[PDB]
Amino acid sequence: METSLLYPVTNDQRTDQKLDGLWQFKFDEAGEGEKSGWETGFHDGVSMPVPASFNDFFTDKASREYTGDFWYSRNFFVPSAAKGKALFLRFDAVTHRATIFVNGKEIRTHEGGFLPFAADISEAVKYGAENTVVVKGNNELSREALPAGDTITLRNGKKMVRPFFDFYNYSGLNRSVHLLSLPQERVLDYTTTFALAGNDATVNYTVETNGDAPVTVSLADADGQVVATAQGKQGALQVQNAHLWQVRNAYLYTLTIQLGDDTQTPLDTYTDRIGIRTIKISGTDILVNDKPIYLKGFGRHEDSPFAGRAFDLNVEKKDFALMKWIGANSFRTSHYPYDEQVYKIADEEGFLLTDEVPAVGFKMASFFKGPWLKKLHERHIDQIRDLIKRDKNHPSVLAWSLFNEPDTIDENAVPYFKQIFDESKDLDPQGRPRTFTLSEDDTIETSKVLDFPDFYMLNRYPGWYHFGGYQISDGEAGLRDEMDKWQKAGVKKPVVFTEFGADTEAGLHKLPSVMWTEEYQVEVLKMFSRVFDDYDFIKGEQVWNLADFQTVEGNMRVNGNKKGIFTRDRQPKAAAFFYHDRWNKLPLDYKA
Amino acid sequence: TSLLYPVTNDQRTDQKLDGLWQFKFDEAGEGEKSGWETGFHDGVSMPVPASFNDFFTDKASREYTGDFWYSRNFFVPSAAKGKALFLRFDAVTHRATIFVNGKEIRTHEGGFLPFAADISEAVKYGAENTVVVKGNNELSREALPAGDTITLRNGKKMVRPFFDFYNYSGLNRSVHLLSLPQERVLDYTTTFALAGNDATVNYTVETNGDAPVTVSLADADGQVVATAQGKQGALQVQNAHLWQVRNAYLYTLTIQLGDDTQTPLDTYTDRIGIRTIKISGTDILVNDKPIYLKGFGRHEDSPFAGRAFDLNVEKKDFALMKWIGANSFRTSHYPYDEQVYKIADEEGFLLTDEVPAVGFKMASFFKGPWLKKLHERHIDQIRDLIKRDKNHPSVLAWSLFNEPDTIDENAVPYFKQIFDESKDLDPQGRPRTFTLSEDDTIETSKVLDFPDFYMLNRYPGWYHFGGYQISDGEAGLRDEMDKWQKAGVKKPVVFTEFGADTEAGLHKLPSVMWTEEYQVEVLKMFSRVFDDYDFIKGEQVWNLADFQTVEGNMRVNGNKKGIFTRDRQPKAAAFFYHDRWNKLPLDYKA
Ligand SMILES: [Cl-]
């Protein structure tokens, strides 16, 4: 029930100072952190950068694999000019679980390590003095929290995780920490939808505030020129001769919201950039601004060698440099909400994102049978609400993914899907498509939930998990056989392939190819391309993965996952040049 | 004028302008005639801090040499009207001109030390303002680090450095928006003495007014243990907790301006360590006991940021250096981000702080009309470095050149001058030195009287007597070590470069150069030599991690002499030092 997830801005009514830097850090295996006073703060631990996953900074494995309570400590200054304002610490992500103490006093908890949350500390600090913030984070996985997984205990006592997902359990203060001072009466939320008529457009907005003061809304273009204004919390901004936002061709207008009448100084100002564009599913078409498009891309994680799962602006800007070069125009934020700065860059660069909530693991290799479904569901729907509230105004969000590879064959999955889909059908004012990925075991013959998603996202791995090597010929025929069945039943919704590919160890070559070589990656991708091109209802290809990424140790995991088109260092495998050639030859309206 | 690191309290603010700026190349040099100083948004987004080179897919951009432009909007709070407003640039590589709201404020030379611009009268308090930076990354023999800029037959400009590392350029370190008091602390100094279990911090405080000064020192739990009034004074610490190698203890210093009656005018706080540094003949003494240096050998180089400071890589580099048993490193070949020293202070490492006086030699140099301006910029960057890093307990010595061409008798006037103009800059009077290249030896070097201790760069078994010849290379190194011993060497000797390129994964039995085994073989050889001579008081191997470099047929995608890979995983040579260095006590050879 987060009152507001607006991204921090700086103006005369709102301040935002980052608390990033080095913190004190201590493990707590015994769980006696609070018994012995760590919540008042400490400086007898190890320095830990923020934001950063804490796991890879340690040379010993038990610390890399640590599972339990852990503590971050820091001092921060509160200016005396802040007295009277609404004061918040905004945590952009604490994986997975956090209790926040300021000066020894408990402020709040939070569940879910991938969305932001703020702590009202207005009453917990001395103004004009140094205060202390302590974070008691937790790490464990259970089937009652997203991402789904288990926590086991080695015979020697140490806890460790057995995830139901691929990626590594990178943990800790994974994203920035802000100190905010906001007006007492302020903007909490706003919403935008768009309509196009001829060369003109209309933004339809609403604004939520914690009070009754008047609301002025003003829309300015790229050069600061005001082009529409309106009064009140509902309204319609008329933009004549609009500059539409276009795939791989962004145009962003600045939106400005202010509280007060013209006898006041503005009691609050908020500011955000939005793109004027519309998204419709029509038949099997995905329409952006009423012309069909064809998705090309990935397939991503937030993973980097030094930050773990933490947001790094350098790695993010290179991922976009690469993705623009290679011809992509879309990617899915698998398998969890990304740092907010990523959606701002997709807006700036004209990319189409599939925003995913962290519901991986709904799949035991009897899931929906059990009793952890009650608590799991609360957290799932709550994480879906907060995700849609945070990112709804980004032009680059195209669709919401509400599961990843859930067990759709279990008939008991249908009551759960009915509930999730019912409870979310109206969260997004733009009413974009809501979907999920179907795993390989989940086909037109075996899935029970094919009626729900607004378009289809298939995860197919012929040539890797099935029909590998010289059997690849049988795998293509068996995929063509499935795609034949969709066609017969007459798919009325678009189909998008969202995973496929091949683990590839850069530098491994063979002629002829063998699984794991660079040549085999290309043969596999060429094979998929031949299938995609032979069916009109296939409307996009998102390969797995963009880069190689870290993973739980295992005998099938050559240090992480290696399915990337690029290495973890962000350099290209042979498959990168394949797609660089294919994707820059496919137009935006491919198949139409 | 002041290089103090920004702090946050009720008198001083500090807000980073890091994030995505706008970016454009200006190969033509038309940017100012085109009105770009007023800000622009028609370029490409570029992270700050970070080198811009590695974000482009084309080589022409990656290698670009000339004028480049950064542009950003920022907000100046109404509440800041009346304070001294500053844009502080932590590093702009290598040249900058600063514009605010289209108005040219300031320029700067040198790409690895911070500078501040007073923008108090160039902004609209309470609205958005524009900052534009016009950077240049050309090299010449008149600027540090030294090199040349050439034009290809196709018009494009290209740099050809006199040093190894790549020409990573742009906004390589954070940008701060500061709010300072009108009367404020500008500088302070610390020196230490010991007596029994007691110590004496001897301070001074530079100010730009006459208001009274008040200094207080508190221990790690916040208890106050000494106060004093006046711009000079001595704090008496009873039963002091000394700052020890790999065993730091940091007191908090608090400078406060204003008399007992008024509102405080300025507060400045820093963390210092109580410890002394003396060169006693051939020993290096920290707190009057002899130490033995072990370490690297470093660069500020990471895959995604390039030259730019990245706190994740830095804490990881420090995690590794403690794991391996090291206790020192040299900031080759330029001052590092200021965070590196604060971590060094908290972890009790000893740093050799190096100014970017690299490439003073060609493949002569001191016999050219470029020295006059070169020397201006050289001694100025020396002054800025010592002024910035003075107060760190962890800075052990200053390095004033890396591999200058000391064979020519003309180097001697220039050294004479550099060494006289730096004589009395560091209040602690720590030792000033420089690295001697392979060609500069006891037989051939002409500047051996100057340094306070000797830093040796030797590459037997790599650039000479490679492969099966290594045994003759070991013999030659002992030859030279015999001649030092003969010459009655009275100052300490520290090996500060040695090693071997190693491609992680290349194995051979028996070894060949470039394999992991050969590297261990080479490092074992150097160890055997170091252990048979008493004046040798330190081994700093080159390099800590594989770092990026100019393209060349001898550069297998950058330098590869690193004990760790560019991703910071170990090569077999990691475990050799992990064994050796964790068995040498801190007083080895005493
Ligand atoms: Cl208070």
Query: CB–CB of A51/A178 below 8 Å?
Result: no
Give the strand pairing for A330-332 and A295-299: parallel
- Fold classification of A279-592 (topology level): TIM Barrel (3.20.20)
Phi, psi (rounded to 5 degrees) for A208: -105, 130
Q: Which residues contact A123 (CB under 8 A, 6 or more apart)?
A: none
Query: CB–CB of B109/B93 below 8 Å?
Result: no
Task: Give dist(CA B372, CA A486) in Å, integer.
Answer: 79
What strands, in cross-sheet order, belong to the sheet with B289-290?
A: B277-280, B283-286, B289-290
Give the CATH superfamily of A1-183: Galactose-binding domain-like (2.60.120.260)
Please give the torsion angle defined by the CA atoms of residues A153, A159, A164 and A166, in that order, rounded to the nearest 10 degrees: -130
- Fold classification of B277-590 (topology level): TIM Barrel (3.20.20)
Number of H helices, E strands in chain B: 8, 30
Q: Tokens at residue A431, please?
A: 């009413």
- DSSP-assigned letter for residue A369: G
Task: Give dist(CA A158, CA A143) in Å, integer.
Answer: 20
Contact B20 A59 (CB under 8 A): no
> How far away is chain B from the Cα of A58, in angstroms, using its nearest Cα?
7
Q: Tokens at residue B63, please?
A: 């290698």
Q: Is the dihedral of CA A421, A427, A433, A436 positive or negative?
A: negative
Task: Give dist(CA B60, CA B67) in Å, integer.
Answer: 14
**Helix or strand run (H / E) with residue B221:** none
HSE on the CB side for A13, CA within 13 Å? 17
Q: What angle do CA B214, B220, B226 make, to 5 degrees?
A: 30
Query: CB–CB of A86/A120 below 8 Å?
Result: yes
Query: CB–CB of B504/B259 below 8 Å?
Result: no
Task: Give dist(CA A322, CA A227) in Å, integer.
Answer: 35
- Detail the DSSP E strand segments found in A37-102: 46-50, 69-78, 86-91, 97-102
DSSP string of B135-171, one letter each residue: EE----TTSSSPEEEEE-TTS-EEEEESSSB----B-
* Residue A48 Cα to chain centre, angstroms: 24
Whether cis (ω within 30° of 0) applies to the bond prior to B378 is no
Please tell me whether residue B230 adopts helix, strand or coil conformation. Answer: coil
Q: Which residues contact B247 (CB under 8 A, 6 or more apart)?
A: B348
Question: Residue B466 burial by CB count (10 A; 0-12/13-18/19+): exposed, middle or buried?
Answer: middle
Where b means 16+ CB within 10 Å and e means fewer, A65-104 reads bbbbbbbbbbebbbbeebeebbbbbbbbbbbbbbbbbbbe
Q: Tokens at residue B78, please?
A: 């109404």
State how far the alpha carbon of B221 is from the alpha carbons of B217, B224, B252, in Å: 12, 9, 10
Query: CB–CB of A199/A242 below 8 Å?
Result: yes
- DSSP-assigned letter for residue A503: -
Which residue is it, tokens 């009754």?
A212
For residue A115, give the amino acid letter.
Answer: L
Cβ neighbours of A314 in B, within 8 Å? 47, 50, 304-305, 308, 310
Q: Which residues contact B24 (CB under 8 A, 6 or more apart)?
A: B31, B36, B40, B42, B43, B44, B68, B69, B71
Phi, psi (rounded to 5 degrees) for A386: -65, -35
**Nearest C-alpha neighbor of B138 from the set B304, B21, B300, B27:** B27
Task: Give dist(CA A374, CA A140) in Å, integer.
Answer: 19
Query: CB–CB of A546/A564 below 8 Å?
Result: yes
Query: CB–CB of A547/A568 below 8 Å?
Result: yes
Task: Give dist(CA A235, CA A212) in Å, integer.
Answer: 16
* Residue A241 Cα to chain centre, angstroms: 34
* A–B interface: beta-carbon pairs under 8 A: 93
Phi, psi (rounded to 5 degrees) for B284: -100, 120
Query: CB–CB of A8/A167 below 8 Å?
Result: no
Q: Where are the domains of chain B?
A: 1-181, 182-276, 277-590
Task: Give dist(CA B264, CA B9) in Å, integer.
Answer: 11
Please tell me whether residue B373 adopts helix, strand or coil conformation. Answer: helix
**Catalytic residue from among A405, A476, A518, A541:** A405
Task: Give dist(CA A198, CA B227) in Å, integer.
Answer: 75
Q: Which residues contact A485 (CB under 8 A, 6 or more apart)?
A: A443, A444, A445
Contact B8 A17 (CB under 8 A): yes
Task: Give dist(CA A138, CA A131) in Å, integer.
Answer: 23
Closest partner residue to B16 among A18, A59, A325, by Cβ? A18
Q: Which residues contact A365 (CB under 8 A, 6 or more apart)?
A: none
How big is chain A by its Cα radius of gyration, in Å? 24
How big is chain B by its Cα radius of gyration, in Å? 24
Region at B9 (left for phi over 0; alpha for psi -120 to 50; beta for the rest)? beta
For residue A52, give the amino acid letter.
Answer: A
Q: Tokens at residue A504, please?
A: 């590839």
Q: What angle do CA B481, B486, B488 make, to 5 degrees?
A: 105
Contact A22 B315 (CB under 8 A): yes
Helix intervals (H) in B508-570: 516-530
Helix intervals (H) in B223-303: none
Where b means 16+ CB within 10 Å and e means fewer, B47-81 reads bbbbbbbbbbeeeeeebbbbbbbbbbebbbbeebe
Give the strand pairing for A86-91 and A177-182: antiparallel
Task: Give dist(CA B587, CA B245) in Å, integer.
Answer: 11
Helix intervals (H) in B326-469: 338-347, 371-389, 411-421
Helix intervals (H) in B281-337: 311-323
Q: How many CB atoms lie within 10 A of CB B265?
A: 19
Q: Tokens at residue A397, please?
A: 């969000």
* CATH for the A184-278 domain, from 2.60.40.10, 2.40.30.210, 1.10.630.10, 3.40.50.720: 2.60.40.10
Q: How many CB atoms lie within 10 A of CB A288?
A: 22
Query: CB–CB of B344/B351 below 8 Å?
Result: yes
Q: How far apart are the first and last CA of chain A?
A: 43
Contact A318 B304 (CB under 8 A): yes
**Helix or strand run (H / E) with residue A540:** strand A538-543
Question: Residue A339 burial by CB count (10 A; 0-12/13-18/19+): exposed, middle or buried?
Answer: buried
Closest partner residue to A317 among B45, B312, B315, by Cβ? B45
Cβ neighbours of A12 in B, within 8 Å? 75, 77-78, 126
Beta-bridge mates of residue B493: B454, B536
Q: How far apart are the first and last CA of chain B?
A: 43
Query: CB–CB of A303/A56 below 8 Å?
Result: no
SS (H, E, C) B474-485: HHHHHHHHHHHH
Where b means 16+ CB within 10 Å and e means fewer, B558-590 reads bbbbbbbbbbbebbbbbebbbebbeebebebbe
Task: Give dist(CA A461, CA A524) in Å, integer.
Answer: 10
Task: Give dist(CA B161, CA A45) in Å, integer.
Answer: 43
Query: CB–CB of A323/A353 below 8 Å?
Result: no
Task: Give dist(CA B175, CA B92) in Å, integer.
Answer: 10
Q: How many CB atoms lie within 10 A of CB B340?
A: 25
Q: Tokens at residue B189, please?
A: 């100094």
Give the strand pairing for B328-330 and B350-354: parallel
**Nearest C-alpha neighbor of B404 from the set B371, B364, B435:** B435
Beta-bridge mates of residue A72: A25, A135
Query: CB–CB of A313/B312 below 8 Å?
Result: no
Residue of A nearest to B127 (CA): A11
Which residue is it, tokens 């799932």?
A380
Where b means 16+ CB within 10 Å and e means fewer, A142-153 reads ebbbbbbbeeee
State how far the alpha carbon of A557 is from the alpha carbons of A334, B504, B550, in Å: 19, 20, 35
- DSSP-assigned letter for residue A337: P
HSE on the CB side for B492, CA within 13 Å? 26
Residue of B nearest to A42 (CA): B221
Q: How many CB atoms lie within 10 A of CB A420?
A: 22
Query: CB–CB of A262/A191 below 8 Å?
Result: no
Kindly give the distance from the C-alpha atom of residue A58 to the centroid of ligand 1, in angstroms, as a whole number. 39
**Helix or strand run (H / E) with residue A215:** strand A215-220
Task: Give dist(CA A266, CA A262) in Å, integer.
Answer: 8
Give the catalytic positions of B in this structure: 403, 497
Task: Give dist(CA A395, CA A384) in Å, integer.
Answer: 18
**Catalytic residue from among A39, A302, A499, A541:** A499
The CATH code that applies to domain B1-181 is: 2.60.120.260
Question: Residue A488 burial by CB count (10 A; 0-12/13-18/19+): exposed, middle or buried?
Answer: exposed
Q: Tokens at residue A274, please?
A: 């939005």
Q: Which residues contact B446 (CB under 8 A, 6 or more apart)?
A: B406, B407, B408, B409, B411, B412
Query: CB–CB of A240/A340 below 8 Å?
Result: no
**Nearest C-alpha neighbor of A398 from the set A425, A438, A430:** A430
Task: Give dist(CA B397, CA B295) in Å, integer.
Answer: 15
* Residue A144 Cα to chain centre, angstroms: 20
Q: Tokens at residue B478, please?
A: 């002992």
Q: Which residues contact A473 (CB under 8 A, 6 or more apart)?
A: none
Q: Tokens at residue A235, please?
A: 């309204």
Q: Tokens at residue B356, please?
A: 């970017």
Please tell me whether residue A555 adopts helix, strand or coil conformation. Answer: coil
Is CATH 2.60.40.10 the right assignment for the domain spanning B182-276?
Answer: yes
Please tell me whether residue A318 adopts helix, strand or coil conformation. Answer: helix
**Helix or strand run (H / E) with residue A20:** none
Q: Is the dihedral of CA A529, A530, A536, A538 positive or negative?
A: negative
Cβ neighbours of B126 in A, within 8 Å? 12
Q: Tokens at residue B503, please?
A: 């491609």
Phi, psi (rounded to 5 degrees) for A459: -105, 105
Region at B536 (left for phi over 0; alpha for psi -120 to 50; beta for the rest)? beta
Annotated catalytic residue A405: yes
Contact A314 B305 (CB under 8 A): yes
Task: Give dist(CA B308, CA A108) in Å, integer.
Answer: 37
Q: Which residues contact A589 (CB under 8 A, 6 or more apart)?
A: A291, A292, A293, A294
SS (H, E, C) A423-450: HHCCCCCCCCCEECEECCCCCCCCCCCC
Task: Give dist(CA B305, CA A354) in Å, integer.
Answer: 28
Please tell me whether residue A565 adopts helix, strand or coil conformation. Answer: coil
Task: Give dist(CA B437, CA B466) in Å, integer.
Answer: 18
For residue A175, give the amino acid letter.
Answer: R
Task: Give dist(CA A149, CA A158) in Å, integer.
Answer: 17
Query: CB–CB of B172/B309 below 8 Å?
Result: yes
Give the strand pairing for B84-89 and B185-195: unpaired
Chain A contact residues (CB < 8 Å to B): 10-12, 15, 17-18, 21-22, 43, 47-49, 52, 56-59, 77, 79-81, 128, 222, 304-307, 310, 312-315, 317-318, 321-322, 325, 345, 348, 568-570
Q: How many CB atoms lie within 10 A of CB A372?
A: 15
Phi, psi (rounded to 5 degrees) for A441: -70, -5
Cβ neighbours of A58 in B, within 8 Å? 319
State how far the alpha carbon of A504 is from the alpha carbons of A315, A321, A510, in Å: 21, 22, 12
Query: CB–CB of B211/B257 below 8 Å?
Result: yes
For residue B277, give the amino acid letter.
Answer: I
HSE on the CB side for A150, CA within 13 Å? 8
For residue A590, give the amino acid letter.
Answer: Y
Contact A321 B57 (CB under 8 A): yes
Task: Give dist(CA B319, CA A25) in Å, integer.
Answer: 14
Which residue is it, tokens 């339990």?
A68
